[PDB]
Structure formats: structure tokens, C-alpha cells
Design an enzyme around this catalytic site. Structure first.
Site, mmCIF file in Angstrom:
data_model
loop_
_atom_site.group_PDB
_atom_site.id
_atom_site.type_symbol
_atom_site.label_atom_id
_atom_site.label_comp_id
_atom_site.label_asym_id
_atom_site.label_seq_id
_atom_site.Cartn_x
_atom_site.Cartn_y
_atom_site.Cartn_z
ATOM 1 N N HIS A 121 -7.445 -6.456 -0.647
ATOM 2 C CA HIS A 121 -6.452 -5.402 -0.445
ATOM 3 C C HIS A 121 -5.479 -5.654 0.707
ATOM 4 O O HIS A 121 -4.329 -5.212 0.642
ATOM 5 C CB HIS A 121 -7.100 -4.041 -0.287
ATOM 6 C CG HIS A 121 -6.139 -2.981 0.133
ATOM 7 N ND1 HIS A 121 -5.254 -2.385 -0.752
ATOM 8 C CD2 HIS A 121 -5.880 -2.440 1.353
ATOM 9 C CE1 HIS A 121 -4.523 -1.500 -0.095
ATOM 10 N NE2 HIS A 121 -4.876 -1.515 1.184
ATOM 11 N N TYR A 127 -1.539 10.959 2.423
ATOM 12 C CA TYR A 127 -2.384 11.396 1.315
ATOM 13 C C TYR A 127 -2.439 12.895 1.031
ATOM 14 O O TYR A 127 -3.001 13.302 0.027
ATOM 15 C CB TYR A 127 -3.807 10.957 1.563
ATOM 16 C CG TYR A 127 -4.096 9.487 1.309
ATOM 17 C CD1 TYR A 127 -4.308 9.006 0.008
ATOM 18 C CD2 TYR A 127 -4.200 8.597 2.368
ATOM 19 C CE1 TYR A 127 -4.616 7.682 -0.234
ATOM 20 C CE2 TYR A 127 -4.515 7.263 2.149
ATOM 21 C CZ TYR A 127 -4.726 6.817 0.843
ATOM 22 O OH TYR A 127 -5.013 5.498 0.615
ATOM 23 N N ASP A 163 0.838 -1.201 0.000
ATOM 24 C CA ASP A 163 0.000 0.000 0.000
ATOM 25 C C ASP A 163 0.878 1.258 0.000
ATOM 26 O O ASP A 163 1.779 1.364 -0.841
ATOM 27 C CB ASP A 163 -1.007 -0.080 1.159
ATOM 28 C CG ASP A 163 -2.022 1.017 1.116
ATOM 29 O OD1 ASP A 163 -2.941 0.915 0.287
ATOM 30 O OD2 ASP A 163 -1.885 1.987 1.914
#
Ligand SMILES: Cc1ccc(CNCCc2ccccc2F)s1
Ligand SMILES: Cc1ccc(CNCCc2ccccc2F)s1
Ligand SMILES: [Mg+2]
Ligand SMILES: [Mg+2]
Lengths: 546, 546
Positions: free
Chosen positions: B523, B465, B334
Site C-alpha cells: 500500500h 474519512y 491514497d
């Protein structure tokens, strides 16, 4: 007025330079003089090499461009290139050849010590060759000694572009006239001179240091042999392992390769190993420097039997288990010495090699109580004083500064006979309130120890001495064995408590025992003679443990 | 009623047994049948071998006694021993031959899981041979899975002496009728039967498990494939490194060999790697599993630019420097994935090999703002929701249990489309208050994450982010490069956010890129398909990183 010093890497902090391999290759291969250096510089500001140095392309991407350039330069000078002519080959070789110019590193070190801000400014490359680790290792060893490392390939600028010097000044927070800049390439010196920095063209190292000495006003050449690199506690990796519900062990960890566990003595700390830690890492080992049970950031349960050797040892084994280490080399000093010998005897599968500083191995006498044995040696009188819970604690905790200042002294400095300590009534009864500082220790270093010992004081450390009977009984279990794994015994000439002759029978128990001996060295081996310790330990590790 | 299970090592938890090498050697060398086993047993209670097993003498001291015994046994049966006949040779070979009987380990594991107290009781030796590390490694792998390991050579007693069984019972705190004891040697079984323990004579493993299954009432044979070994947080070594004044990084550390740095994703933890850590250590690596900046016991400064990739990466480099590691293998998932790719591009000298789970490498588009790029992909809508400081923090912190229970789900379990998250007003707006537990995670494991996230919540994780522009600009600096160090990309078939096809162009940037692919895998790669992850990572490490 000068406050900062800036060094290049190639030709200044590392020799030989990689430009020198261009020229010597030419010679060795009888090519047109300069041919390789023309190919290398081909295109200038917009050529392959500049793009390398600016970090646009990786070393491996560059290699075939430099090929193309050599091919073209040799075409124009109407000559052929040899069979198997290889730029990867030439560069791999250049790069492994360059080592740290030790005297330049030492000068940088000295100026940092007297207060300079130091920097490496280098034109360099993103190195992605199979053999890159070579250079990674060099850069690691160098950069730790400097305030800043500025890499052409990270900042996207190169010498002699003027913007890198402005970036440099801006990194130093210093004005150009406060800065000396050494380079082996004069073109790279020019823009530093234009801004008015002091500059030194480095041809041979000694002339440059002579110029550097002149201009800074600090002795740099012919300076005495310095200490090994020491550790800054708050730069270390600090690790912690719970070996059982009420006990966690702290250690400091540096380096990769065979695991080497350092076990300090009474009343010390991981920091006793501060000179050995970077040296042995540098030497290619994974160093774990413990706080032993009872000290520092390790747990210090109150009960005496928590500090018998059997329990201490089982715990060190558990520490390996939880770290996932099947073995380690165990190196001890003083009490940590006695422990490693016992690790060798009861857990040889877990011990790669064993070494002791000062502490000899002496089998238990099954025909004589350990207390008798102790009364039989005038110099061990202090140990009987240690027996009564509370008494020695009160003396040793009363003034921690004075305590460590009184204990940590060189052989020609002592303030405390171990003589009739019980009779006298204490270990310090006839030593000063405020002793002078030993040449072995700065004031800051005494204070670290003091601070550590504020956590738990002396009950845990003293308890190590309070299992004479239990240790004797357990040791008696090992009377039929010999130590046959690799083993080193380092005697300290002037240790008046663990005298060298106490080690004289050890070959009966350890037939292939190896030895070192250190002259003019008191009880605090690691900090009294750090250089000589480091040399003996690495030589032994490289021969017997690797 | 049975509550404890006790296993021997030789012939039960490890095969083949070392007695079997006595017999097969005899055969192989055409000596008198039994001759070596007679020499081995010579003298009985007072013979060399018993003294070994009792810990009176070391293996290496025993070797020449067993020699003497073989010499005498062959004399009495009037035969000669072959040229170069070697007991060291024979034993070195026996001992390296014995491996863990996997199905016996698995049965022990299963009984421990259902509540049994488990033990290894073994007659064994202090092993001081040059090759001892071999056995140290085996013992390490076995002992972690048991409540107690009792070694004849540590306690000074041997099977079949009756006192070791009393010592055994006393260690279990269990009465003999609550105990099953498996041994391959019937004489050793006798005294357990006399005290009334259930006993199993182990000839072939499967019969013994069938008997063990019968008698305990638990399925042991033909049981489905178990999970890999997981980590108990409070059994780990926990390390801490200050990379700069306001930032310290925490990691867990297991194993020795090439350093392997694991970098978890959003919003995860070192514990995301709990299945890989023991497996990769076992596989011969030094695993460092990070808490990445912003998580767990690592620091979480508030400012957004603290979490741009450039700063994150420089920090990981500093972490290597302070640990004294010139390189490491970097394996990410990730966000930890994106970071390792960037470590490869800007610091290839520090990266031994690089691998990513789920996260593809996708160069920055210099012709398109990163925000445009994000709006161009419906499934990244959640990321725009993440932009406004405070908004996502409030949702994610509101109910940590619900948060982790909602995110950590397998592909056939989801409760949250990534669809129009901004429009909906939150990531959980249309998912339950109290979601069910995923098959991937126990309730205890959710609670560890919850507890970690109580320290700093979601501001640091979310900040990762919030540097879209800064990361784009920095990434643009690397547009001329290729990744040419070893590299592995593992795609997860059912990751609906980082879909496998997003990785399809990667060979343009990474020409020798290696691949793995995991089917039916969502995921949360590491905990969805731990076994398949472990296999792909070790195979790749052993081929490209070792
Ligand atoms: C196994 C061992 C037994 C004895 C040992 C010596 N301990 C000395 C510590 C010490 C104490 C006090 C002053 C100086 C000083 F150095 S080690
Ligand atoms: C470099 C990268 C960019 C985007 C990446 C994916 N992040 C997903 C995290 C996540 C968030 C929310 C729910 C599930 C979930 F998995 S990695
Ligand atoms: Mg130069
Ligand atoms: Mg057996």
C-alpha cells in the site's frame, strides 16, 4: 446607498464576447443569419448548452452535441455546412480572442477601492480542452480583483434562473436595492430588475461606465492612470531556505516561468518590490522577492564579515542549489544592485540575465583604497558615519516610523541632505520629529516596514556598508573579466546618491549592456515610478531573458 | 585509516572529458596530431588557458585567445585550418556531450554513506556562454552529493600547483595519508602522491573502482542497485500559503519547469514523497509536495466538514491562485489520490494532467448510500471504526512510534489485518507493542513522522474519512461528466486495501486513461518501490504533461 457591484465576464469584463463569434462566423461563412445561435440555444432549459453551463457535462463533451445541433438547424433551413466546418476550431479561436476589457476592470477596481463589494457572476463551463490553460490564465488575472466569483458551472444554476440572483444576494450579504448589476444580455438583467437591483445593459463600455458613474456617484471614466497591482503580504506564498547552519533566507514567490530573483536595497524589504511582483508574474515569470540577509524574516547574524559580498553571493548560490534552480535572472536595486553585478562576475553560469536599478557597476580601483574613494565623494559622507558599530544603529532604531518616513520620499519632497552627515552628527539631526507622509507611501505601508525592522533592527543592514576593504580585495580578483551575459542598467534621473553619470563608463566592462532611464525619479525607484519600472523590466525580460 | 575521497570532474565524475574533444576533433578533421592540445596548453603557467582556470578571464573571453593560439600552432607546423573551423562550436559540443559517469557517482555515494568525507576538486572555468545553463545543471546534480566542491576558478589556484592540495587538505581537515585522490591526468596526481595521499590514475572507470575498492576496503563495484536520492527536510525550501483565515498549507518545493503538486495519503506527510522529489526535479519539473490539510505544518482545524472533498478541493485551487499558478499537474496517493480525481472533475482548467497511485476513480452510486457501500466490503471495516470522533484518535495517538512502525510495512511484512477491526475493538489490538522496523523505513524516518504528528495528532487526518455523505452528494453532481484531460492510474499489485481490480472499470469514465502497474508492491507505494514509481511518473510526465 449602493454598496455592491456585480459584473458578468463575457461582454462586460472580457471582450470580444463568445456569442459574437457565433454571429461573425455566420457572416464570414455566409450561413443563414442566426443559424449558429439557434444551434447554440437548441432545447433551451433542457438543451445541451444549459447542461454545460450548469456543470453537468464538460466543454469537450458538449462540442459534439453542438455539432449535432448545427447539423439539425442547417437541415431544417435546407442549407449545407462548409468543408472542414469545425466547432472546436471556432470556439478555440473565440476563447483565445477574448481579452480583459481594461476600462471595465479599472472601474470595478475603483469601486472596490471606495468601498464596494464586487463580484463576477458568469454563465460558464468546465473547460477541459487541450487549450484550457488560456482561460485559466484570464480567470486568474480577473478573480484576484473581486470579492466573489460565482460560476454557473460550480453552483449548478444559470442566468436567467431566479435562484442564482437569490444565491448572489445571499453571497453579497446585501439587499437587492444596494446592488448594481451590469450585463450585456437584457434577458439576464430582467430578474435582477424584478428584485429591484439597479441594472446596466452594457453595449459599449463607455456608455455603461457613464451610467455606472451617474448611479454610484463615483468617478470611473477619464480617471487618472492607476497604480500597478500591489501585494497584500498575508496573501503571498512565503518560502524559507536554510543556506547554512545559522542563516535562513525568506522570500515571497509568485508566478511560473523563468525564475526571477529580486534583490532589494538599504534599508528595505521584499515589500520594496510590491508593485513589480504581480506585474512580472502576470508577464510570465516566477518571481522570488527576497528579504536579503539582515532583513525582515531572513536571519541577521551580528558579525560584520557575515555581510561581505563574497559571503552574501555564495549564499545566494546556495539558495539556488537548495531550491533546485540552475539559474535565475537577478534584478537588484541599491545594495541588491551591487550584489547582482557581483553574481554576474563570479557566478555567470547561475545568472540567466542581470539587471540593476540605480546601482552602476564600477570596478574596484586597485590603486586606491576604498575609504579614500569614499572620502573623494561628498555625497557618500553618510557611509563614513555608518562605519562605527552602534552609532547609526542608535539613530535609525530610535524611531522607526520617523526613520522610514524620512528616507522614503520622492525627489521633490526630501527632508535630508546627505551632506556633512558626520559633521552634523547624524542622518536626521536636521529633519523633523514627525515628518509628513510621502506621496509615494501610505501610512499602512510605512507600518509594515516598521514591523519588519522590529525583528532585527539595523545592525545587519548597516553591516553591508562595513566590508569596504574585504569587498575591494575580492572585487580586485575580477579586474580581468568582462560581463558578457545579458545586462540592463536603469538610471534614475533624480537619484542624488547614485546619480546617472556614475554609470557612464559601464560599457567598457559590459560591451552589450542595455539601458533604461527614468525621469523625475528619486532613489526609491520601485515605488516612485512603479509603472515605468514594470514596463522597462518586462520589455527587457521578454527580449533578453526569455 | 582512509577517511576522505576526492574526485576530479572531467574524466572522472563526467565523461567524455573535454581534452578528448581536442584529440578527436584533430582526428575527425585530419589536423596534425596534438595541434589543438598544443594551442590549448600554449604558454603554460602564464598562458590564456591558466588564466581561465584561475578565474582571471571568462570562458567567452578565452575563446578568441584559443583561436589565436590555434592560428599560431598551425602556422609553425605549416598547415591550414578548415573553412568554418570554430572553437566555440567544438567546445559547445564537448560540454553538452559530457554526462555524469553514473558508476563513479555511485561509488562516491557509497563511500559517503559509510562515512567518508567526499570532495570534487576540479580545474574549471567561469562559464558565460549562451549555453552555460547546460553545465550549471550538471554541476548542480553532482555537487549535492559531496561534502565540498573546490573550483580552480573560484579559489584562484589550479592543479598541479602545490598550494591547491594544501588548500584541499585544509578543507577536508584531514591529513594527506587519510585521503584517496582520483584523477585521469598523471601530472595532477604527482603532487598528491608527494604529500603522501593514496592516488588512483583513472583510465577506465571499472579498474579505478577496483583499485578504489581494494584500497578503501568497501564494496563499490557490482554493488546492488541503490535507492533514489532522498530529501533531507532541513535542506528543503519550505513554503506556506494562507488559503483562508484559519488555514495555511505547507509544502516543500524543488526544481523548475511545469508545476507538479504531490498529494500524500492517510496518515502520511510531504515526506512520503521523499524519493520522488529530487528525481522529478532532476527530470525537469517544479515539484510542490504538500502537507495536506490536517497534517504536519499545514493547519488542522477540528471541525469535520473542514475535510469534505469540496472544501479540500476549493482550497487547493486557492493555493494555486495565491501562488499565481494557472495549472498544475496533480499526482496523488491514497486519499491524495481521491482528491486529484476530484480536482480533475470539478476544476479541469487548473489541472495540467492527473495521476493516482493505488486510488482508483469510482463514481458515486446515486442508488446506494456510501455507508452501505462501505459495509459491502469486508476490507473497509476499519473505516467504520474511524467514524466515532475520539475512538481511533485515542488508539493512533497513544504510541506514535508503534503506530507508524505498524502501518508502514511492505507486503511480506504486515502485522495488521484490516479484518473485523470494529469487532476486535481497534486497529492494533492484535499487533505488537514494539514492532520491528520495516525494510522500507529507517528508524530516523519513522521519527520524522512521529514528530510531525505531535503537532496535531489524528483528528484532522481522521476527519477525511468522516464526510462519506457530503462527498457522496457532491460527487453525484459529476455523474454526467467524463475525465478527458491526461490521466494515469498506477495500480500496486499487493495493496490489499486498494486492490488493482477495484480500478477495472475506470476506462468507462476516463476513455484515454493511461496505466502503470507495480508488482510485489504494498500500500505504501512511494517508499516500497521508489525506483519503479519514479520511472513510471517521469515517462508519463514527459509524454503527457510536457
Ligand atoms: C553598493 C552601494 C553603495 C552605496 C549605495 C547607496 N546606498 C544608499 C542607501 C541610503 C542610505 C541612507 C539614505 C538614503 C539611502 F538611499 S549602494
Ligand atoms: C479515498 C479512499 C478511501 C479509502 C482509502 C484507503 N485508505 C487507507 C489508509 C490506511 C488506513 C489504515 C491502515 C492502512 C491504510 F493504508 S483512500
Ligand atoms: Mg454575456
Ligand atoms: Mg582531468
Amino acid at each position: 446607498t449602493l454598496r455592491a457591484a456585480v459584473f458578468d465576464l463575457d461582454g462586460v469584463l472580457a471582450l470580444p464576447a463568445v456569442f459574437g463569434v457565433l454571429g461573425r462566423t455566420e457572416e464570414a461563412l455566409a450561413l443563414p443569419r442566426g443559424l449558429l445561435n439557434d444551434a447554440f440555444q437548441k432545447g433551451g432549459p433542457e438543451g445541451a448548452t444549459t447542461r454545460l453551463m450548469k456543470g453537468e457535462i464538460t466543454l469537450s463533451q458538449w462540442i459534439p452535441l453542438m455539432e449535432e445541433n448545427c447539423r439539425k438547424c442547417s437541415e431544417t433551413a435546407k442549407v449545407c455546412l462548409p468543408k472542414n466546418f469545425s466547432i472546436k476550431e471556432i470556439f478555440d479561436k473565440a476563447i483565445s480572442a477574448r481579452k480583459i476589457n481594461r476600462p471595465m476592470l479599472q472601474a470595478a477596481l475603483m469601486l472596490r477601492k471606495k468601498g464596494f463589494t464586487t463580484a463576477i457572476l458568469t454563465n460558464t463551463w468546465l473547460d477541459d480542452r487541450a487549450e484550457r490553460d488560456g482561460l485559466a490564465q484570464l480567470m486568474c488575472e480577473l478573480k484576484m480583483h473581486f470579492d466573489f466569483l460565482i460560476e454557473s458551472c460550480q453552483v449548478g444554476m444559470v442566468k436567467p434562473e431566479p435562484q442564482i440572483y437569490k444565491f448572489l444576494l445571499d453571497t453579497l450579504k446585501a439587499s437587492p436595492s444596494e446592488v448594481v448589476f451590469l450585463d450585456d444580455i437584457g434577458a439576464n438583467l430582467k430578474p435582477a430588475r424584478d428584485l429591484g437591483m439597479v441594472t446596466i445593459l452594457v453595449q459599449d463600455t463607455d456608455t455603461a461606465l457613464k451610467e455606472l458613474e451617474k448611479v454610484t456617484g463615483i468617478q470611473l471614466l477619464n480617471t487618472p492612470a492607476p497604480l500597478p497591482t500591489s501585494c497584500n503580504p498575508s496573501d503571498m506564498s512565503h518560502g524559507y531556505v536554510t543556506v547554512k547552519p545559522r542563516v535562513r533566507l525568506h522570500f515571497v514567490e509568485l508566478g511560473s516561468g523563468p525564475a526571477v530573483c529580486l534583490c532589494h536595497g538599504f534599508p528595505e524589504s521584499w515589500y520594496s518590490w510590491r508593485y513589480q511582483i504581480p506585474a512580472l508574474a502576470q508577464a510570465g515569470y516566477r518571481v522570488l522577492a527576497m528579504d536579503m540577509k539582515g532583513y525582515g524574516e531572513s536571519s541577521a547574524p551580528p558579525e560584520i564579515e557575515e555581510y561581505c559580498m563574497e559571503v552574501l553571493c555564495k549564499e545566494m548560490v546556495t539558495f539556488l542549489d537548495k531550491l533546485g534552480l540552475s539559474q535565475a535572472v537577478f534584478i537588484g536595486h541599491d545594495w541588491g544592485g551591487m550584489l547582482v553585478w557581483y553574481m554576474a562576475l563570479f557566478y555567470p553560469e547561475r545568472v540567466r540575465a542581470v539587471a540593476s536599478l540605480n546601482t552602476p557597476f564600477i570596478p574596484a580601483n586597485p590603486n586606491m583604497s576604498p575609504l579614500e574613494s569614499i572620502k573623494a565623494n561628498p555625497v557618500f559622507d553618510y557611509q563614513l558615519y555608518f562605519q562605527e558599530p552602534g552609532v547609526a544603529e542608535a539613530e535609525l532604531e530610535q524611531n522607526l516610523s520617523r526613520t522610514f518616513k524620512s528616507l522614503f520620499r520622492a525627489s521633490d519632497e526630501s527632508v535630508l541632505s546627505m551632506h556633512k552627515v558626520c559633521e552634523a552628527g547624524g542622518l536626521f539631526v536636521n529633519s523633523p520629529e514627525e515628518p509628513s507622509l510621502s506621496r509615494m507611501v501610505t501610512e499602512e505601508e510605512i507600518q509594515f516596514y516598521v514591523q519588519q525592522f522590529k525583528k532585527s533592527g539595523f545592525r545587519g543592514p548597516l553591516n553591508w556598508y562595513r566590508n569596504m576593504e574585504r569587498n575591494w580585495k575580492w572585487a580586485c580578483k575580477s579586474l580581468g573579466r568582462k560581463i558578457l551575459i545579458p545586462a540592463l542598467m536603469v538610471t534614475a534621473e533624480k537619484d542624488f546618491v547614485l546619480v546617472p553619470q556614475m554609470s557612464q563608463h559601464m560599457e567598457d566592462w559590459i560591451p552589450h549592456l542595455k539601458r533604461g532611464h527614468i525621469e523625475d525619479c528619486g532613489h526609491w525607484t520601485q515605488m516612485d515610478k512603479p509603472t515605468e519600472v514594470n514596463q522597462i523590466l518586462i520589455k527587457w525580460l521578454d527580449s533578453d531573458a526569455r
